[PDB]
Amino acid sequence: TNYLHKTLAHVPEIVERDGSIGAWASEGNESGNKLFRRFRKMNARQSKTFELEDILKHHWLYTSKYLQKFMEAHK
């Protein structure tokens, strides 16, 4: 399979070039899809014209750091 080849031949060279593998994984987007589904069902206008704009705005607001600073509020 093509993954057995990739993982038995090219792994040392990969971890030497950059220094990491798992830190550049596709997890961030795969898991963000969950947020996309929950924002297209609960937080967007129910119309074909406007709704991509609402999902985009609310998903940009959920992923800010400045608004995540207040979730801890110094414990």
Partner 1 sequence: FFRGTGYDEKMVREMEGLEASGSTYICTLCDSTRAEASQNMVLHSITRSHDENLERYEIWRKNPFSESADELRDRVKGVSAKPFMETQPTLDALHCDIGNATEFYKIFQDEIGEVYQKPNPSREERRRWRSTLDKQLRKKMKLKPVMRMNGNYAR
Partner 2 sequence: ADTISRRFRYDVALVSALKDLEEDIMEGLRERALDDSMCTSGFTVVVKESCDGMGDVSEKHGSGPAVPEKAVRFSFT
Partner 3 sequence: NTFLSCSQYHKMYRTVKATSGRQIFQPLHTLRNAEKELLPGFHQFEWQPALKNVSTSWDVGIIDGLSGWTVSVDDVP
What residue numbers does the annotated binding site for a divalent metal cation cover?
Answer: 30
Calculate Rg over the CA atoms of the chain: 19
* 40 CB-near residues (< 8 Å, 6+ apart): 51, 55
- Pick the stretch among 26-34, 41-49, 53-61, 66-74 that binds partner 1 (CB under 8 A): 26-34
Residue 2 or 64 having the CB closest to DNA: 2
Q: How far, in Å, CA of 53 to CA of 55, rounded?
A: 6
CA 40 – CA 46 distance, rounded (Å): 9
Told to check if 1 binds partner 1 by CB under 8 A, we report yes
Residues contributing to the site for partner 2 (CB under 8 A) = 24, 26, 28-30, 32-33, 36, 40, 46-49, 52-53, 56, 60, 64-66, 69
